[PDB]
Design a protein around this nucleic acid. Structure first.
Lengths: 117, 59, 113, 156, 138
RNA sequence: GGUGAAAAGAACCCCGGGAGGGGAGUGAAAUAGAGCCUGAAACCGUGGGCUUACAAGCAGUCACGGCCCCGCAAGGGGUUGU
RNA sequence: UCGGGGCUUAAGCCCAGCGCCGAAGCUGCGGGUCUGGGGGAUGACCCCAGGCGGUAGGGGAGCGUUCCCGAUGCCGAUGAAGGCCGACCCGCGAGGGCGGCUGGAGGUAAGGGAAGUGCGAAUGCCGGCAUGAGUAACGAUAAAGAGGGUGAGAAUCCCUCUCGC
RNA sequence: ACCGGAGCGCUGUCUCGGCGAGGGACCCGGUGAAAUUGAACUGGCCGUGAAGAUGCGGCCUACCCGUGGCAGGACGAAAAGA
RNA sequence: AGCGGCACGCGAGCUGGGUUCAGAACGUCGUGAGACAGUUCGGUCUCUAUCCGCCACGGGCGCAGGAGGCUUGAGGGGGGCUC
């Protein structure tokens, strides 16, 4: 019973090869350095799922505020508005709707304003 | 095999840069007076010549 | 058409001939002739040789005429080499490789109209 | 192993300030043609398994076959002499077409000779009746011979 | 959905004074406009935050004793070559450079924050080159 | 250690000092051309697509965007300015 | 140089109220999982409550290799194995097919046995190829020059004037 | 031709160096290697952190590749600490 | 005729006088082999700078018409003495 080391090695190797193709470095060819790169990239990707979520909620609120500024006052007010007011929803990026069709926004603005007043 | 020692593998790119300065340069030429040949500038083409008539001996 | 010419297994390290061919890499045949014969190398003679033998293969085999001939492709890829053992002080088992090249001038049509 | 290599017993390197690694004699699995670690040798994978146990096997083997009914016990045969022909005709008379199999029990060489060369037909006999053989095939042919024979092996 | 992306909108030009203003809070707003952060059309990687021309920064105000006590430092690579010139003398000779460099420390630093510092034009006059709009602010 | 079922292992011409190629011709295959089966990986290189000359970097990941090619659409791929 | 700028009725400190950002924590929706519980005679299966950071390490399940039985069967000239590729489907995963290209003669299902069984590192073993780099070096400072010859090609081979040790 | 101290003559040992010669080094043609090498898209400052940073923070500086040349460093290579 | 830091600055820049290799000696301890924060004499310090850096010299593009000559000084570097 001889167990030749066969093709298995080069098979899985060409797998990882396919994965890491596109990189720079000798890691764009080196079946070893490539792998290490993949590790890194995978972790980076996960952390960046959660991250990306933060990134966007951020951008959202940035814009939201910009709009609320150009109308009457500042963000924190406005939001304590909706939060208190009534509209117990909005989806912060569906506030970023505000960037398109300012009308409905401004309506919500004066709503949150006249709310806690 | 002494004091100075390359610490790392120079990149193929780096290679190609140090090489980016080489470039097998082209020469230049001029046509031979009262014949059809290409001699270098300010020279006496073997078979051809200047205004005097020297050499000319190619079989 | 395009006339494939070459000379495999010939002495000369790549880098050198590589750069000699790229001196002429795609141009007019007359140009190529004069540049090859009048630049200071040795891969000069080699490449000029294989090139002449390129014009040879398009003149009497394929029909095109040099008038409408220009250098398509060119290269020079390396074969193996010799591996000659050269001694060093303190008796160091030292090897000097002896590289080798494959000049590949092709050439063909000028117009087509 | 690394023991019976026709190589050496000498340390090729010094050990210390070699500049190279640290070994000894070529006969080491790390090296080229050197021996292997634990590898291939002569063994006996076989062992001793209780008669009782395996006897059940014998019995149980036929039992399953008998639980199906594929065993014939003809006192003798019609293809008496040694000829593939007559056994073939008799095989029409038994209906053993050409898509069956003979763990072919019975005790008469002439019978074995006929269906010796047959392919769908292994023939097997009773002196050394083995359960693997009946598993792989199907036709305890026989006389009362091999049944009388069987009985003695498993009666207690 | 999928958050929206502004096209190549129009780089709005603007104008602010300079005088009567704190050094501090001045640039503060100014800068924050180079970023389209005032605009409901802000996008991190695009740079559409307006132009800021400033006028008469020769007469900027500042609190503290600053005026004299406020020193700025420049280091030329050659050793011993840390130069420091007070805000005092930065006013007398080329005074814009105290409004410039101020904003310059109020934006990010990614390549664009540079290109964006370019998107701002300081003068100690008023006066400028009336290019277009530049409708005043406060 | 493996050309090919078989030596049928390349007559002729052509460039060429030869070395080696380029038509012809040999065979199913010359992608079997003579240390020639099947030739993987690094490895050098010919051409093409994308981007790069005010920028500070474990070389990637998230998103936006542009440029290049399949897709009926709506979607996919490669590349990289921020 | 306070993390840098810049803050002086503060962007500093003391006091109080209100407010918003905010982490993978907590809740909402969807999937995998285990451990309990139930309807299941129903194993299957949905539902229900609780749990799933994690080296050494103890523990369970599986992928792939090599051969064997399954092999006088079975697949393969319309092409076996290996490779080139791939944006499609399957399993969370190690993997598995299918599709096209290569190539040429083997491979072996479902179900089971067995072992030299799966490498990235050991200044590891053998092999091949880059690296510095067109750089160091090209064996004594006695020393070279012209004319002519040959031949495809001569500083470098041959012939005489010279010059040197 | 062994190890101290002295004096006399002499002198680029010195003040304190300046010039010249050749053989290298430099460019052109032919040949053309070594140890080292985790990968490199490798800047200073002030901080940091297994206490000595291109890479981490902070700031500032920096158009892309070389050639001659100089050795501070890359805890420089060489020697699995004598 | 300052003091101090900078791997008690500086050996991939020199020195190799000190220092602690193997020889030999004097004192000295030790029966001894040897030994001594004692001493005397002798003692092989490796040519090729790959990256950062630093002194100088260019090539590529740039400078949002094209070419020749003249230039403002943003920002630096030298310089500063004393009897």
């Amino acid at each position: 019973p001889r167990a030749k080391t066969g093709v298995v090695r080069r098979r899985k190797h060409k797998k990882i090869l396919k994965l890491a193709k596109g990189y720079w470095g000798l890691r764009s060819k080196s079946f070893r350095k490539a792998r290490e790169t993949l590790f890194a990239a995978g972790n980076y990707a996960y952390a960046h799922r959660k991250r990306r979520k933060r990134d966007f909620r951020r951008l959202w609120i940035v814009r939201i505020n910009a709009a609320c500024r150009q109308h009457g006052l500042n963000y924190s007010t406005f939001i304590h508005g909706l939060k208190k007011a009534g509209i117990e929803v909005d989806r912060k990026n569906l506030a970023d709707l505000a960037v398109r069709e300012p009308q409905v926004f401004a309506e919500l603005v004066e709503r949150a304003k006249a709310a806690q007043g | 095999a002494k004091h100075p020692v390359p610490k790392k593998k120079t990149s193929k790119a780096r290679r190609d840069a140090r090489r980016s300065h080489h470039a097998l340069t082209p020469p230049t030429l001029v046509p031979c007076p009262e014949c059809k040949a290409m001699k270098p500038p300010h020279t006496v083409c073997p078979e051809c010549g200047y205004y005097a008539g020297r050499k000319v001996l190619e079989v | 058409m395009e006339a494939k010419a070459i000379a495999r297994y010939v002495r000369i390290s790549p880098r050198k001939v590589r750069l000699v061919v790229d001196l002429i890499r795609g141009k007019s045949l007359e140009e190529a002739r004069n540049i090859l014969r009048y630049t200071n190398k040795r891969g000069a003679y080699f490449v000029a040789k294989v090139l002449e033998s390129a014009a040879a293969n398009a003149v009497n085999n394929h029909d095109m005429l040099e008038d409408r001939l220009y250098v398509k492709a060119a290269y020079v890829d390396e074969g193996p080499a010799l591996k000659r053992v050269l001694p060093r002080a303190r008796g160091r088992a030292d090897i000097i490789k002896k590289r080798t090249s494959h000049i590949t001038v092709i050439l063909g049509e000028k117009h087509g109209k | 192993t690394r023991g019976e290599v026709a190589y050496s017993g000498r340390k090729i390197w010094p050990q210390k300030h070699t500049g190279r690694a640290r070994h000894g004699d070529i006969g080491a699995p790390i090296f080229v043609g050197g021996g292997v670690v634990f590898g291939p040798k002569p063994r006996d994978y076989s062992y001793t398994l209780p008669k009782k146990v395996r006897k059940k096997g014998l019995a149980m083997a036929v039992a399953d076959r008998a639980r199906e009914g594929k065993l014939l016990l003809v006192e003798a045969f019609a293809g008496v002499n040694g000829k593939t022909k007559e056994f073939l005709a008799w095989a029409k008379e038994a209906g053993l077409d050409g898509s069956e199999s003979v763990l072919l029990v019975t005790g008469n060489e002439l019978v074995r000779r006929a269906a010796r060369n047959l392919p769908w037909v292994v023939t097997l006999a009773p002196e050394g009746l083995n359960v693997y053989d009946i598993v792989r095939t199907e036709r305890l042919v026989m006389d009362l011979d091999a049944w009388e024979v069987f009985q003695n092996r498993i009666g207690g | 959905m999928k958050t929206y992306v502004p096209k190549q909108v129009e780089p709005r030009w603007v104008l602010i004074d300079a005088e009567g203003k704190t050094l501090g809070r001045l640039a503060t707003k100014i800068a924050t406009l180079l970023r389209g952060k005032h605009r409901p059309d802000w996008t991190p990687n695009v740079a559409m935050g307006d132009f800021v021309v400033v006028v008469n920064a020769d007469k900027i105000r500042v609190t503290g004793k600053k005026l004299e006590q406020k020193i700025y430092t420049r280091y030329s690579g050659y050793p011993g070559g840390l130069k420091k010139i007070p805000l005092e003398k930065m006013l007398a000779t080329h005074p814009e450079r105290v409004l410039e460099h101020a904003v310059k420390g109020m934006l990010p630093k990614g390549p664009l924050g540079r290109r964006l510092f370019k998107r701002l034009k300081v003068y100690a006059g008023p006066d400028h080159p009336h290019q277009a709009q530049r409708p005043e602010k406060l």
